[PDB]
Amino acid sequence: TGERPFSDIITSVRYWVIHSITIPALFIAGWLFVSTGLAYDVFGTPRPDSYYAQEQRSIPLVTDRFEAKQQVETFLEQL
Amino acid sequence: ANLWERFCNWVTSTDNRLYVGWFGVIMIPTLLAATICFVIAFIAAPPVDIDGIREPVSGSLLYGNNIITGAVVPSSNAIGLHFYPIWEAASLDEWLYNGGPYQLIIFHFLLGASCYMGRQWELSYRLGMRPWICVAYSAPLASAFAVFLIYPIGQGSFSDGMPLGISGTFNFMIVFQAEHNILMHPFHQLGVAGVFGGALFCAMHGSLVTSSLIRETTETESANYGYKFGQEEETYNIVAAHGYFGRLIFQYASFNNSRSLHFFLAAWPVVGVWFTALGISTMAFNLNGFNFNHSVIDAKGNVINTWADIINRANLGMEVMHERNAHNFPLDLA
Amino acid sequence: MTILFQLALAALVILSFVMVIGVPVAYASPQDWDRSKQLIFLGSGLWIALVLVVGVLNFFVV
Amino acid sequence: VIAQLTMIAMIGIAGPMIIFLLAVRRGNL
Amino acid sequence: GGRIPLWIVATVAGMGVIVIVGLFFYGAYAGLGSSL
Amino acid sequence: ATNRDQESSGFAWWAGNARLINLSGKLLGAHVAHAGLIVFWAGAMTLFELAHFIPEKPMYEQGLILIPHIATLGWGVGPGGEVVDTFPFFVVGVVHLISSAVLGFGGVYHAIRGPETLEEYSSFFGYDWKDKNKMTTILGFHLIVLGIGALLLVAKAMFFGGLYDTWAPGGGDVRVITNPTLDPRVIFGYLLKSPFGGEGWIVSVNNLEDVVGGHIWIGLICIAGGIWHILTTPFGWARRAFIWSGEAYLSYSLGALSMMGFIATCFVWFNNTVYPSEFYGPTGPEASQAQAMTFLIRDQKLGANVGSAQGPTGLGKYLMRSPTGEIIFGGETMRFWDFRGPWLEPLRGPNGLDLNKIKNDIQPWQERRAAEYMTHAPLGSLNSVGGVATEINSVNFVSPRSWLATSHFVLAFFFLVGHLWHAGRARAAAAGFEKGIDRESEPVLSMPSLD
Amino acid sequence: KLPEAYAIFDPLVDVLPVIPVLFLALAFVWQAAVGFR
Amino acid sequence: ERGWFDILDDWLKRDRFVFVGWSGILLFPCAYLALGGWLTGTTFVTSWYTHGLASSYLEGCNFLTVAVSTPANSMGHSLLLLWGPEAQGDFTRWCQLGGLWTFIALHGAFGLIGFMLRQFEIARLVGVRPYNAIAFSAPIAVFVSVFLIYPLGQSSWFFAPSFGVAAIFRFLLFFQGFHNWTLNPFHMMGVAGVLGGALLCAIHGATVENTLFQDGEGASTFRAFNPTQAEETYSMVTANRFWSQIFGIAFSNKRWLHFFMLFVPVTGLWMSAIGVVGLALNLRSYDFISQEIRAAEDPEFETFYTKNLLLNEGIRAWMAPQDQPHENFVFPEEVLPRGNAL
Amino acid sequence: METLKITVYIVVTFFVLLFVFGFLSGDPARNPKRK
Numbered sequence A: 001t002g003e004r005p006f007s008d009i010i011t012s013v014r015y016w017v018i019h020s021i022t023i024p025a026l027f028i029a030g031w032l033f034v035s036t037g038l039a040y041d042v043f044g045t046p047r048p049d050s051y052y053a054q055e056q057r058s059i060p061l062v063t064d065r066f067e068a069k070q071q072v073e074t075f076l077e078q079l
Numbered sequence B: 001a002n003l004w005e006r007f008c009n010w011v012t013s014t015d016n017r018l019y020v021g022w023f024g025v026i027m028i029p030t031l032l033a034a035t036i037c038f039v040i041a042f043i044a045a046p047p048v049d050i051d052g053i054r055e056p057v058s059g060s061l062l063y064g065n066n067i068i069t070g071a072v073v074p075s076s077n078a079i080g081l082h083f084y085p086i087w088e089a090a091s092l093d094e095w096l097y098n099g100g101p102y103q104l105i106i107f108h109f110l111l112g113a114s115c116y117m118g119r120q121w122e123l124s125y126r127l128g129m130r131p132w133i134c135v136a137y138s139a140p141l142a143s144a145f146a147v148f149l150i151y152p153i154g155q156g157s158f159s160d161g162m163p164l165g166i167s168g169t170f171n172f173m174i175v176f177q178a179e180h181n182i183l184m185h186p187f188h189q190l191g192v193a194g195v196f197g198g199a200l201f202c203a204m205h206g207s208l209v210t211s212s213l214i215r216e217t218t219e220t221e222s223a224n225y226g227y228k229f230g231q232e233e234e235t236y237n238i239v240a241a242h243g244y245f246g247r248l249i250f251q252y253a254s255f256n257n258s259r260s261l262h263f264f265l266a267a268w269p270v271v272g273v274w275f276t277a278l279g280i281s282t283m284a285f286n287l288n289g290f291n292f293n294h295s296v297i298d299a300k301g302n303v304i305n306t307w308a309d310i311i312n313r314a315n316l317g318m319e320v321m322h323e324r325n326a327h328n329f330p331l332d333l334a
Numbered sequence C: 001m002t003i004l005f006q007l008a009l010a011a012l013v014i015l016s017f018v019m020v021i022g023v024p025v026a027y028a029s030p031q032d033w034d035r036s037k038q039l040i041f042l043g044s045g046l047w048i049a050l051v052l053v054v055g056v057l058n059f060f061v062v
Numbered sequence D: 001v002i003a004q005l006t007m008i009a010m011i012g013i014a015g016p017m018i019i020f021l022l023a024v025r026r027g028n029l
Numbered sequence E: 001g002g003r004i005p006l007w008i009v010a011t012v013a014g015m016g017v018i019v020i021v022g023l024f025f026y027g028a029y030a031g032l033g034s035s036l
Numbered sequence F: 001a002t003n004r005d006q007e008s009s010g011f012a013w014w015a016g017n018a019r020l021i022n023l024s025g026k027l028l029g030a031h032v033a034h035a036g037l038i039v040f041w042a043g044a045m046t047l048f049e050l051a052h053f054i055p056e057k058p059m060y061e062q063g064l065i066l067i068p069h070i071a072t073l074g075w076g077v078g079p080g081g082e083v084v085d086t087f088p089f090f091v092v093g094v095v096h097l098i099s100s101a102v103l104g105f106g107g108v109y110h111a112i113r114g115p116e117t118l119e120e121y122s123s124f125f126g127y128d129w130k131d132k133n134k135m136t137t138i139l140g141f142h143l144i145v146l147g148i149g150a151l152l153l154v155a156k157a158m159f160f161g162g163l164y165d166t167w168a169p170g171g172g173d174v175r176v177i178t179n180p181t182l183d184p185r186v187i188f189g190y191l192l193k194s195p196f197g198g199e200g201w202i203v204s205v206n207n208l209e210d211v212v213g214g215h216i217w218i219g220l221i222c223i224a225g226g227i228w229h230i231l232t233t234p235f236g237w238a239r240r241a242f243i244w245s246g247e248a249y250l251s252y253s254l255g256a257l258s259m260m261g262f263i264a265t266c267f268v269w270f271n272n273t274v275y276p277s278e279f280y281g282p283t284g285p286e287a288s289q290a291q292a293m294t295f296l297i298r299d300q301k302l303g304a305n306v307g308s309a310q311g312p313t314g315l316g317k318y319l320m321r322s323p324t325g326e327i328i329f330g331g332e333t334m335r336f337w338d339f340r341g342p343w344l345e346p347l348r349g350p351n352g353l354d355l356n357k358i359k360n361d362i363q364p365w366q367e368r369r370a371a372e373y374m375t376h377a378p379l380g381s382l383n384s385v386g387g388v389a390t391e392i393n394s395v396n397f398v399s400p401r402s403w404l405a406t407s408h409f410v411l412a413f414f415f416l417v418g419h420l421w422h423a424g425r426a427r428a429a430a431a432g433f434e435k436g437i438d439r440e441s442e443p444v445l446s447m448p449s450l451d
Numbered sequence G: 001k002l003p004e005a006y007a008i009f010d011p012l013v014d015v016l017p018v019i020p021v022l023f024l025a026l027a028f029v030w031q032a033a034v035g036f037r
Numbered sequence H: 001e002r003g004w005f006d007i008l009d010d011w012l013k014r015d016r017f018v019f020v021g022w023s024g025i026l027l028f029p030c031a032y033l034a035l036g037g038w039l040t041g042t043t044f045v046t047s048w049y050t051h052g053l054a055s056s057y058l059e060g061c062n063f064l065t066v067a068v069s070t071p072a073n074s075m076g077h078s079l080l081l082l083w084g085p086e087a088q089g090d091f092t093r094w095c096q097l098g099g100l101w102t103f104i105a106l107h108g109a110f111g112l113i114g115f116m117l118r119q120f121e122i123a124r125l126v127g128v129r130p131y132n133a134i135a136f137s138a139p140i141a142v143f144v145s146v147f148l149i150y151p152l153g154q155s156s157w158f159f160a161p162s163f164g165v166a167a168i169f170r171f172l173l174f175f176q177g178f179h180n181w182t183l184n185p186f187h188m189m190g191v192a193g194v195l196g197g198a199l200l201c202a203i204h205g206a207t208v209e210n211t212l213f214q215d216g217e218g219a220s221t222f223r224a225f226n227p228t229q230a231e232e233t234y235s236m237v238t239a240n241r242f243w244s245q246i247f248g249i250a251f252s253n254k255r256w257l258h259f260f261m262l263f264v265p266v267t268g269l270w271m272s273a274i275g276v277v278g279l280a281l282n283l284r285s286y287d288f289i290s291q292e293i294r295a296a297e298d299p300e301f302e303t304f305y306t307k308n309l310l311l312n313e314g315i316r317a318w319m320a321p322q323d324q325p326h327e328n329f330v331f332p333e334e335v336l337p338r339g340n341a342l
Numbered sequence I: 001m002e003t004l005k006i007t008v009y010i011v012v013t014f015f016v017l018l019f020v021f022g023f024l025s026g027d028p029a030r031n032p033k034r035k
Ligand code: CLA
Pocket: C019, C020, C021, C023, C024, C028, D018, D019, D022, D028, D029, F002, F003, F004, F005, F012, F013, F014, F015, F016, F017, F019, F020, F023, F026, F027, F029, F030, F031, F033, F034, F101, F102, F104, F105, F108, F111, F112, G024, G027, G028, G030, G031
């Protein structure tokens, strides 16, 4: 076809200069996404202390179609 | 020459319509005995006390089975791994009660199919071929050894070998999932990858070659008429096939070497099925699938279920119901 | 004794690590084979003696 | 644990190091 | 485009994959998902 | 780079080691370096086991496979398999580890520095695969070595402290074997025993006198066979039967190793004499037999008459008969009635399990061992959750028996494949068609058609 | 446990049994050095 | 070439590292969204509100146990659009309600359409017959029947397969216990096609490799092939004689052989799809009525078919309460079917 | 049962003997190329 061979690209000093910075910056950005707790709130995933209230015996299961969003909200308020 | 040298010449003759050979000399009688016993038992055998609890299970068509429910039933748990030939029994009546036909079938069958594998090596030598077709066959053969011999050995009984029938096979699968969590075993997973991949590459190879047949036939006649038995020229264009597939994915994701391509076709399902066989042969000794039951715990210590735990709930259903009269003590240890 | 043992064993460990690298590299090197052959023989001798020393001293720290 | 990871790092590198040492030296690889 | 030899790039990338995968196995035994 | 490419050797990189077939010096290197890895693992693995080892927990709860091997030889253990001294464990690991540096040295030297071929340099050490006399002579040397190896076992057993004897009267203990079994009717008798249930061929050997006598026989046989092979060349019927080539000798050895792997799998799975349950954990049959014993004890303590208690099926809940009439445990464990074990034999009389003894003579230590073995059955998951497949996480256990059986079934299996691969390749190469069919001398084209 | 005098070499001992696997991996580094010729 | 359309066509069909084509405008974003939806969900997204389950690396799951799980049964067959009436543009809520499930299922469905168009498009440009595309209809019939038809016949998407390794296993066991799917003759033809396909794959690759002509000197035989060479690299004649004498029959026609390799697994997967359409409606092959009547009347009549139904009834009773949380099943201990002891 | 046992033992010995003597009878030579 046309494109520069991968062989060339990944043995070239310029490749390693660019990616010795971009690879670790992305990795660290990935790490912070979790370490700040940011992941939990974007996706709405419970932390280990947020699955159940202290005395709750049942799961906060969605049972309503059109107000399920509001149910989660209610279920979330009492934790 | 002498009578013996003539015999040897015949046995090993490359000219018999079906090759006989030295492996064949063991294969022919064992496979005939297994076949004949199997057919007669499948049609007519009385019920077999598989679990040695005087609870005879009906396998045969005359005793109320159809093709789907029918089976030759494993020999009695009271026998275990004891050798139970016809002459060890007081009568055929007793032999049938205790599942003697099963041992006769599976022993002659295993010897015969092992010789079937040897015979494949043998003929290829007689014909000046490279010798490894027999190695490809070792994969299904190993799988047959896994369910008819190794598993019984590990568990202490032929009553736990796979039953020689359709519904019987399913019973074996289900009890196996309960006792070993086979689905969560990576060798079984490699087996699935092996057979799903085998199917896939089959559909692929079939389709790539077919799509590439050279125009040799009329718009009305089958394209199969475009290929003649023994012709020296290759009947399809592999460069066109590669041109297609290399573009479907990317160039280097595609084969242009027929030899390495056919190697991959041999290796992928054969290796995956080896792992399947080895899955069953190692769960034979109770090294089981991954257990992540109650693996996720919350801050307090509440168990947070995963899909592994729902698997556990289904396995439990199988466990407590299987062989519903055979257990007296709380743990099922074989 | 206990300090003596531990250095002797640390020294075996360190010598070992230099043998592990040095012996293959030496053996497959084009030029330097005069100086190499001698040291290999020397390192080998030091390594053996050090095994005996740790072996004997074991009985004083154990 | 830091001791373990360091040990496995030094042992881990010994292999490729040799190869590299021979490659730089145009050795009999 | 030839400076760093492909065998080193492969040995290094290959060691990274081992390390990150080794870490994932360690985490099976520690923290969330460890059953403890 | 003398034939270290595909062009020169005609073997691709992934078949690289086939390049060594006629390079005796480099090949000796491969072999010595390899034995170094073996001896290395043995020594380092031992040390790792010893570092992790808590003497008061059973070996079998600790993931140990090598310490149990050392202990069975009588090192480091006392009555009941109690660890009295870990230093022999230590000695065994260190000496293997040091020794492996020596082998590794030799291996690396011959592989990389010494003469690639040995024939120019020496005729004693040089060899041609097709020299039937040299081949039987090397073979003969190793037979003598192997023989001495068997006699070292004997030496340990009779003259250097004895062996761990799970059957020792009064309880398991180390014991000197003074009267080994020499009668060929017994020793060779084992070889003619059926491999099926209640028989078990050689796996059945149930006393150290037989084990010692067997090794006396084997050491002698092997030295004798070694002398024989140094002094002789193969008879013509042997010459006409075999392929005579490096690749073919490999294939025969591959077949014998696969077979041995399989035997080893059954040995560790069933046998509790040379794999004492004190070290290795209970066998599957043993653990199953322990459960019925445990509930028989419990229930009878509660007032049950265990002999006349009819189970739901009509068979006895606790006791029943084997197909030959012997009294045996009931429920599923009926299959395991061939099991024999030192915590159980005291209850067995001439007719099988004795109801008089069961009612009166069950000692606390028997209850204890049965409870122990019931709850260490060799069942667990690949991630080492002990228990049935539906068990919750809590117990970190897979029996050493399952690890040793499973690993060796896999190894024996692939070795069998290896055997078929190399046997078939050796046959084809000897006849000259291992690279494919000659387009101008295609055998099938010269044969009559089938129909 | 290791005798106390050796405790220092404990973490080293924890990593040694893995060394054989590293020899298999090394063959592949080496073959890559020589282009898999 | 002329107008903008033809210029665009030029650009789409350029011979590059990854072909694009017109099918690529469909294929690439839908394949990428389906896959990144899967990796995103399995990495970060819970199933707590829909199933009462953890299902992500974030929560402690591993590769075998993570999933993007189906929405709650109360969602019915809702499309569950981000901007639909359930989530109302709230991304977090959407994730919590099962939005990634339909996201992955629908993008995956359009991606699969795109892939098969890519197969028709490439074959047309290379000038080959489009058999590969036709073969791919089998994966399509499986995806559509199992991921769409099935849950559409049932009460809601909740009962579709969830996208995960362990989740799919659960799906298997549910089909055994509830539908007795192993008994179903359409699943059996599926098995025959898959195992027969795998057999045909192993056996064809091994046969070629063991009747190769010697076209080189190398003991490694891969180099003794040339893509442009006129001749067969292996002997059909010897292969035919070998199988005829071994098995009793052999292929003689290479075009037949390959067509058959397409036919067997493709037909297999199509048959399984038909059975799964049946199961969408609980139209099972569950029972043999004649066995039930005999077994009801004769308590000494037993077969493997009766034995497996006791297993199924164990599976239903024991897995349903946690597997179907919206039913609020409470099954007191005394009602659970169990054999002796266990 | 005894005559059955003896008949089968004889059967099996016969076929086993054929297999053993069979492969002892110059098998490597029974191929189409180098003999
Ligand atoms: C047990 C494993 C094992 C062993 C013992 C060997 C041994 C050998 N191989 Mg095979 N090989 C193996 C596995 C092994 N191989 C695997 C897994 C592959 C596939 C990747 C191959 C693929 C292969 C090819 C393609 C070739 C070989 C060749 C060879 C031989 C020559 C090596 C050489 O010239 O290196 C040169 C390499 C170096 C100089 C780098 C250093 C190598 C040394 C030995 C490393 C030692 C490090 C060690 C830690 C030192 C301890 C020292 C201490 C005791 C003092 C040698 C006998 C060659 C051949 O047969 O020659 C005729 C050949 O062409 N091998």
